[PDB]
mmCIF file of C-alpha atoms in Angstrom:
data_model
loop_
_atom_site.group_PDB
_atom_site.id
_atom_site.type_symbol
_atom_site.label_atom_id
_atom_site.label_comp_id
_atom_site.label_asym_id
_atom_site.label_seq_id
_atom_site.Cartn_x
_atom_site.Cartn_y
_atom_site.Cartn_z
ATOM 1 C CA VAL A 1 -0.196 0.170 0.257
ATOM 2 C CA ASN A 2 0.906 3.489 -0.304
ATOM 3 C CA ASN A 3 0.167 6.711 -2.160
ATOM 4 C CA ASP A 4 -0.918 4.886 -5.674
ATOM 5 C CA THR A 5 -2.666 2.427 -3.943
ATOM 6 C CA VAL A 6 -4.810 5.072 -2.414
ATOM 7 C CA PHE A 7 -5.259 7.350 -6.000
ATOM 8 C CA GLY A 8 -5.431 4.380 -8.354
ATOM 9 C CA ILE A 9 -8.926 3.152 -5.857
ATOM 10 C CA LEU A 10 -10.881 6.791 -6.157
ATOM 11 C CA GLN A 11 -9.965 6.603 -9.887
ATOM 12 C CA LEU A 12 -12.925 4.500 -9.820
ATOM 13 C CA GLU A 13 -14.808 7.467 -8.772
ATOM 14 C CA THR A 14 -13.666 8.349 -11.992
ATOM 15 C CA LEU A 15 -14.332 6.214 -14.287
ATOM 16 C CA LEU A 16 -17.607 6.315 -12.411
ATOM 17 C CA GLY A 17 -18.265 9.432 -13.241
ATOM 18 C CA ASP A 18 -17.217 8.620 -16.851
ATOM 19 C CA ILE A 19 -20.100 7.143 -17.276
ATOM 20 C CA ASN A 20 -22.488 8.670 -16.058
ATOM 21 C CA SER A 21 -21.649 11.111 -18.096
ATOM 22 C CA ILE A 22 -22.043 9.478 -21.267
ATOM 23 C CA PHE A 23 -25.551 8.544 -19.854
ATOM 24 C CA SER A 24 -26.402 12.019 -18.869
ATOM 25 C CA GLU A 25 -25.907 13.328 -22.495
ATOM 26 C CA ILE A 26 -27.917 11.272 -24.377
ATOM 27 C CA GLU A 27 -30.882 11.238 -21.692
ATOM 28 C CA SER A 28 -31.023 14.934 -21.842
ATOM 29 C CA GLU A 29 -30.335 15.169 -26.073
ATOM 30 C CA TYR A 30 -33.023 12.063 -26.704
ATOM 31 C CA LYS A 31 -35.972 13.075 -23.293
ATOM 32 C CA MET A 32 -35.155 9.860 -21.652
ATOM 33 C CA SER A 33 -35.113 8.380 -18.672
ATOM 34 C CA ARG A 34 -31.775 5.579 -18.484
ATOM 35 C CA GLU A 35 -34.132 2.729 -17.913
ATOM 36 C CA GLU A 36 -35.459 4.003 -21.813
ATOM 37 C CA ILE A 37 -31.924 3.844 -22.945
ATOM 38 C CA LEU A 38 -31.333 0.298 -21.221
ATOM 39 C CA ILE A 39 -34.752 -0.436 -22.863
ATOM 40 C CA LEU A 40 -34.234 0.861 -26.249
ATOM 41 C CA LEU A 41 -30.588 -0.414 -26.332
ATOM 42 C CA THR A 42 -31.865 -4.137 -25.748
ATOM 43 C CA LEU A 43 -34.596 -4.148 -27.880
ATOM 44 C CA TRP A 44 -32.114 -3.486 -30.270
ATOM 45 C CA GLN A 45 -29.647 -6.636 -29.001
ATOM 46 C CA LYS A 46 -32.332 -8.607 -28.316
ATOM 47 C CA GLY A 47 -35.137 -7.912 -30.430
ATOM 48 C CA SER A 48 -38.366 -8.061 -29.886
ATOM 49 C CA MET A 49 -39.807 -9.595 -26.893
ATOM 50 C CA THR A 50 -42.962 -8.787 -24.134
ATOM 51 C CA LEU A 51 -42.713 -5.938 -21.106
ATOM 52 C CA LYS A 52 -42.515 -9.390 -18.815
ATOM 53 C CA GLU A 53 -39.321 -9.969 -20.902
ATOM 54 C CA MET A 54 -37.528 -6.596 -20.945
ATOM 55 C CA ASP A 55 -38.271 -6.640 -16.793
ATOM 56 C CA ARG A 56 -35.342 -9.325 -16.733
ATOM 57 C CA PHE A 57 -33.287 -7.728 -18.522
ATOM 58 C CA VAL A 58 -34.002 -3.965 -16.998
ATOM 59 C CA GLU A 59 -35.126 -2.455 -14.024
ATOM 60 C CA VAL A 60 -38.671 -0.572 -14.185
ATOM 61 C CA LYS A 61 -39.913 0.085 -10.785
ATOM 62 C CA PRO A 62 -43.349 -0.638 -11.037
ATOM 63 C CA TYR A 63 -45.492 3.008 -10.080
ATOM 64 C CA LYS A 64 -43.826 3.586 -13.290
ATOM 65 C CA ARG A 65 -43.671 1.169 -16.012
ATOM 66 C CA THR A 66 -46.558 2.109 -17.624
ATOM 67 C CA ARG A 67 -45.163 5.830 -18.413
ATOM 68 C CA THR A 68 -42.146 4.253 -18.858
ATOM 69 C CA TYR A 69 -42.743 1.699 -22.164
ATOM 70 C CA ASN A 70 -45.172 4.809 -22.800
ATOM 71 C CA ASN A 71 -42.771 7.744 -23.242
ATOM 72 C CA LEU A 72 -41.074 5.383 -25.799
ATOM 73 C CA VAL A 73 -44.458 4.917 -27.694
ATOM 74 C CA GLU A 74 -44.621 8.733 -27.771
ATOM 75 C CA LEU A 75 -41.549 9.099 -29.039
ATOM 76 C CA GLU A 76 -41.970 6.127 -31.825
ATOM 77 C CA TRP A 77 -39.540 4.792 -30.993
ATOM 78 C CA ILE A 78 -41.329 1.459 -30.306
ATOM 79 C CA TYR A 79 -44.948 0.239 -30.568
ATOM 80 C CA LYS A 80 -46.814 -2.174 -29.303
ATOM 81 C CA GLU A 81 -48.366 -5.959 -30.566
ATOM 82 C CA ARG A 82 -50.933 -7.067 -28.110
ATOM 83 C CA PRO A 83 -51.729 -10.929 -28.465
ATOM 84 C CA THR A 84 -49.357 -9.710 -21.946
ATOM 85 C CA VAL A 85 -47.588 -6.831 -24.666
ATOM 86 C CA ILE A 86 -44.913 -7.468 -26.831
ATOM 87 C CA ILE A 87 -42.823 -4.304 -28.311
ATOM 88 C CA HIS A 88 -41.330 -3.854 -31.570
ATOM 89 C CA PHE A 89 -39.454 -0.938 -33.017
ATOM 90 C CA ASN A 90 -40.485 1.385 -34.930
ATOM 91 C CA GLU A 91 -37.750 0.597 -38.095
ATOM 92 C CA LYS A 92 -39.274 3.908 -39.580
ATOM 93 C CA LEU A 93 -36.528 5.764 -37.258
ATOM 94 C CA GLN A 94 -33.882 3.083 -38.097
ATOM 95 C CA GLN A 95 -32.437 6.388 -39.523
ATOM 96 C CA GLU A 96 -32.482 8.104 -35.789
ATOM 97 C CA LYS A 97 -31.468 4.877 -34.101
ATOM 98 C CA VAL A 98 -28.329 5.096 -36.439
ATOM 99 C CA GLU A 99 -28.217 8.608 -35.337
ATOM 100 C CA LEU A 100 -28.124 8.094 -31.552
ATOM 101 C CA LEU A 101 -25.703 4.836 -31.815
ATOM 102 C CA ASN A 102 -23.225 7.749 -33.308
ATOM 103 C CA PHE A 103 -23.824 9.989 -30.295
ATOM 104 C CA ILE A 104 -22.976 7.606 -28.190
ATOM 105 C CA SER A 105 -19.873 6.640 -30.336
ATOM 106 C CA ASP A 106 -18.855 9.800 -30.178
ATOM 107 C CA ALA A 107 -19.430 10.442 -26.338
ATOM 108 C CA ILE A 108 -17.837 7.594 -25.592
ATOM 109 C CA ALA A 109 -14.525 7.882 -28.444
ATOM 110 C CA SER A 110 -13.813 11.542 -26.603
ATOM 111 C CA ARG A 111 -13.490 9.523 -23.468
ATOM 112 C CA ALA A 112 -11.742 6.642 -24.012
ATOM 113 C CA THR A 113 -8.838 7.670 -23.216
ATOM 114 C CA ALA A 114 -9.398 8.782 -19.775
ATOM 115 C CA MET A 115 -11.469 5.531 -19.306
ATOM 116 C CA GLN A 116 -8.324 3.453 -19.748
ATOM 117 C CA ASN A 117 -6.346 6.002 -18.017
ATOM 118 C CA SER A 118 -8.452 5.247 -15.025
ATOM 119 C CA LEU A 119 -9.163 1.427 -15.094
ATOM 120 C CA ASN A 120 -5.359 1.071 -15.494
ATOM 121 C CA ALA A 121 -5.302 2.752 -11.771
ATOM 122 C CA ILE A 122 -7.834 0.518 -10.192
ATOM 123 C CA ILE A 123 -6.931 -2.819 -11.734
ATOM 124 C CA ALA A 124 -3.224 -1.571 -11.267
ATOM 125 C CA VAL A 125 -4.299 -1.879 -6.678
ATOM 126 C CA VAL B 1 -22.461 1.653 -38.105
ATOM 127 C CA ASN B 2 -24.435 -1.184 -36.145
ATOM 128 C CA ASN B 3 -23.832 -4.402 -34.238
ATOM 129 C CA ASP B 4 -21.613 -5.621 -32.386
ATOM 130 C CA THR B 5 -22.402 -1.540 -31.330
ATOM 131 C CA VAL B 6 -25.484 -1.708 -29.413
ATOM 132 C CA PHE B 7 -23.636 -4.668 -27.512
ATOM 133 C CA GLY B 8 -20.530 -2.597 -26.745
ATOM 134 C CA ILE B 9 -22.775 0.720 -25.230
ATOM 135 C CA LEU B 10 -24.832 -2.113 -23.175
ATOM 136 C CA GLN B 11 -21.292 -2.367 -21.701
ATOM 137 C CA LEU B 12 -21.331 0.791 -19.668
ATOM 138 C CA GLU B 13 -24.202 -0.374 -17.474
ATOM 139 C CA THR B 14 -22.640 -3.574 -16.885
ATOM 140 C CA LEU B 15 -18.915 -1.839 -15.972
ATOM 141 C CA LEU B 16 -21.250 0.985 -14.204
ATOM 142 C CA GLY B 17 -22.460 -2.269 -11.968
ATOM 143 C CA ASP B 18 -19.147 -3.199 -11.379
ATOM 144 C CA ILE B 19 -18.233 -0.460 -9.777
ATOM 145 C CA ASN B 20 -21.336 -0.483 -7.638
ATOM 146 C CA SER B 21 -20.252 -3.618 -6.885
ATOM 147 C CA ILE B 22 -17.497 -3.016 -4.996
ATOM 148 C CA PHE B 23 -18.010 -0.117 -3.645
ATOM 149 C CA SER B 24 -21.129 -2.128 -1.884
ATOM 150 C CA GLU B 25 -18.839 -4.688 -1.052
ATOM 151 C CA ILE B 26 -16.437 -2.439 0.887
ATOM 152 C CA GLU B 27 -20.053 -0.810 2.058
ATOM 153 C CA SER B 28 -21.278 -4.195 3.940
ATOM 154 C CA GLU B 29 -17.709 -5.783 4.755
ATOM 155 C CA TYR B 30 -16.807 -2.465 6.804
ATOM 156 C CA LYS B 31 -20.191 -0.230 7.662
ATOM 157 C CA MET B 32 -20.081 2.376 6.090
ATOM 158 C CA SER B 33 -21.474 4.249 3.569
ATOM 159 C CA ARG B 34 -20.175 5.217 0.393
ATOM 160 C CA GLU B 35 -19.236 8.867 1.407
ATOM 161 C CA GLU B 36 -17.373 7.389 4.056
ATOM 162 C CA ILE B 37 -14.958 5.378 2.355
ATOM 163 C CA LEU B 38 -14.798 7.817 -0.011
ATOM 164 C CA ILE B 39 -14.011 10.564 2.513
ATOM 165 C CA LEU B 40 -11.257 8.278 4.395
ATOM 166 C CA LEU B 41 -9.439 7.713 0.808
ATOM 167 C CA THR B 42 -9.395 11.165 0.969
ATOM 168 C CA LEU B 43 -7.717 11.896 4.012
ATOM 169 C CA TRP B 44 -4.732 9.535 2.978
ATOM 170 C CA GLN B 45 -3.826 11.345 -0.231
ATOM 171 C CA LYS B 46 -4.448 15.153 0.957
ATOM 172 C CA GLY B 47 -3.931 14.993 4.900
ATOM 173 C CA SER B 48 -5.501 16.537 7.413
ATOM 174 C CA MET B 49 -7.897 19.326 6.290
ATOM 175 C CA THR B 50 -11.474 21.478 6.786
ATOM 176 C CA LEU B 51 -14.631 19.340 7.109
ATOM 177 C CA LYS B 52 -15.683 22.044 4.217
ATOM 178 C CA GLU B 53 -13.104 21.536 2.183
ATOM 179 C CA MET B 54 -13.642 17.792 2.405
ATOM 180 C CA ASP B 55 -17.303 18.893 0.615
ATOM 181 C CA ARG B 56 -15.206 20.008 -2.245
ATOM 182 C CA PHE B 57 -13.883 16.888 -2.768
ATOM 183 C CA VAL B 58 -16.504 14.808 -1.317
ATOM 184 C CA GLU B 59 -19.704 14.758 -1.951
ATOM 185 C CA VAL B 60 -22.064 14.693 0.909
ATOM 186 C CA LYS B 61 -25.351 16.286 0.720
ATOM 187 C CA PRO B 62 -25.898 18.089 3.632
ATOM 188 C CA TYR B 63 -28.700 16.415 5.618
ATOM 189 C CA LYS B 64 -26.457 14.047 6.347
ATOM 190 C CA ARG B 65 -23.070 15.806 7.101
ATOM 191 C CA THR B 66 -23.836 15.305 10.508
ATOM 192 C CA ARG B 67 -23.709 11.456 10.802
ATOM 193 C CA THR B 68 -21.628 11.164 7.613
ATOM 194 C CA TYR B 69 -18.160 12.701 10.004
ATOM 195 C CA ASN B 70 -19.849 10.855 13.251
ATOM 196 C CA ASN B 71 -19.940 7.604 12.156
ATOM 197 C CA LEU B 72 -16.396 7.893 11.436
ATOM 198 C CA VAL B 73 -15.378 9.388 14.611
ATOM 199 C CA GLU B 74 -17.742 6.182 16.681
ATOM 200 C CA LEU B 75 -15.523 4.295 14.042
ATOM 201 C CA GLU B 76 -12.433 5.831 15.593
ATOM 202 C CA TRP B 77 -10.759 5.887 11.479
ATOM 203 C CA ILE B 78 -11.042 9.666 12.959
ATOM 204 C CA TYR B 79 -10.838 12.196 15.351
ATOM 205 C CA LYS B 80 -12.205 16.826 15.448
ATOM 206 C CA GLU B 81 -9.817 18.858 15.873
ATOM 207 C CA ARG B 82 -11.642 22.090 16.611
ATOM 208 C CA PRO B 83 -10.112 25.864 16.359
ATOM 209 C CA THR B 84 -14.388 25.301 11.069
ATOM 210 C CA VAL B 85 -13.733 21.977 12.185
ATOM 211 C CA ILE B 86 -10.444 19.661 10.888
ATOM 212 C CA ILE B 87 -10.402 16.131 10.990
ATOM 213 C CA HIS B 88 -7.449 13.576 10.654
ATOM 214 C CA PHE B 89 -6.910 9.771 10.466
ATOM 215 C CA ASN B 90 -6.625 8.545 14.049
ATOM 216 C CA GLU B 91 -3.138 6.806 13.558
ATOM 217 C CA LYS B 92 -3.497 4.267 16.101
ATOM 218 C CA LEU B 93 -5.749 2.495 12.994
ATOM 219 C CA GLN B 94 -2.699 2.543 10.843
ATOM 220 C CA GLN B 95 -3.178 -1.815 10.491
ATOM 221 C CA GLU B 96 -6.673 -0.921 10.098
ATOM 222 C CA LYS B 97 -6.073 1.230 6.777
ATOM 223 C CA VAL B 98 -3.567 -1.092 5.974
ATOM 224 C CA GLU B 99 -5.861 -4.554 5.557
ATOM 225 C CA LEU B 100 -9.511 -2.287 4.315
ATOM 226 C CA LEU B 101 -6.636 -1.935 1.522
ATOM 227 C CA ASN B 102 -5.599 -5.101 0.748
ATOM 228 C CA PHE B 103 -9.750 -5.476 0.970
ATOM 229 C CA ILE B 104 -10.600 -3.327 -1.568
ATOM 230 C CA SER B 105 -7.239 -4.502 -3.704
ATOM 231 C CA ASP B 106 -8.706 -8.143 -3.232
ATOM 232 C CA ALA B 107 -12.515 -6.914 -4.959
ATOM 233 C CA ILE B 108 -11.443 -5.013 -7.453
ATOM 234 C CA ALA B 109 -8.665 -8.388 -8.260
ATOM 235 C CA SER B 110 -12.037 -10.124 -8.510
ATOM 236 C CA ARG B 111 -13.775 -8.286 -10.913
ATOM 237 C CA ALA B 112 -10.444 -7.154 -12.743
ATOM 238 C CA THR B 113 -10.456 -9.535 -16.076
ATOM 239 C CA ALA B 114 -14.171 -8.752 -17.026
ATOM 240 C CA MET B 115 -14.185 -4.717 -16.466
ATOM 241 C CA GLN B 116 -11.129 -4.755 -18.873
ATOM 242 C CA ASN B 117 -13.401 -6.971 -21.130
ATOM 243 C CA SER B 118 -16.323 -4.589 -20.657
ATOM 244 C CA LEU B 119 -14.464 -1.203 -21.345
ATOM 245 C CA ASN B 120 -12.583 -3.203 -25.019
ATOM 246 C CA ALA B 121 -16.319 -3.233 -25.914
ATOM 247 C CA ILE B 122 -17.357 -0.183 -25.007
ATOM 248 C CA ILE B 123 -14.574 1.747 -26.741
ATOM 249 C CA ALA B 124 -14.442 -1.415 -29.497
ATOM 250 C CA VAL B 125 -18.489 1.119 -29.864
#
């Protein structure tokens, strides 16, 4: 244990801050909550699924569950199928998906070096 | 353009979770809040300072300020000097400091591979 041990541990908070700044930027630009963004990303990754299934991947507090999905519908990112409720990506926002992904890619790229520097310090503890 | 793009972006949440898990592991073992751990580490990094000075390094919400610093006093990690309040590390706990830093080192090492794998995926976005 030395000065570098304590500095390295403190870089956990640095790295955390960088990640939270990325999310905060996406949230404000797209007027979405953290949960809404994670839902949309998960939908793109895994494809169409029921709300109960999406619950397994993203924590949505019961008090705002219907609000959360309604918000994604009103933004036109998703639509519902009723056979249980199944959500689908609205393929009419394909270009908007590409733009959002590029916005996140740029936000990440701007902090890549700093994030790797922090993690090097963390892992060297 | 696309995928593995979405996967990498989702690893932001994974990496965030890893960091929070490390803090949660420390919190449970040492019966300290996140703020208390950061205060203690900052104290070891920078040395003795006033509460006002510490509050610029670590976010301590005013409603939990008095219990945050009192908890550190009751755990015997620090003591107060009154000229504004100045806090000092209690050097009787030098061995405990070393043990805490080793505990943190182990919690990091436990997740180090996964964390670097997450950051590689993030940076590849």
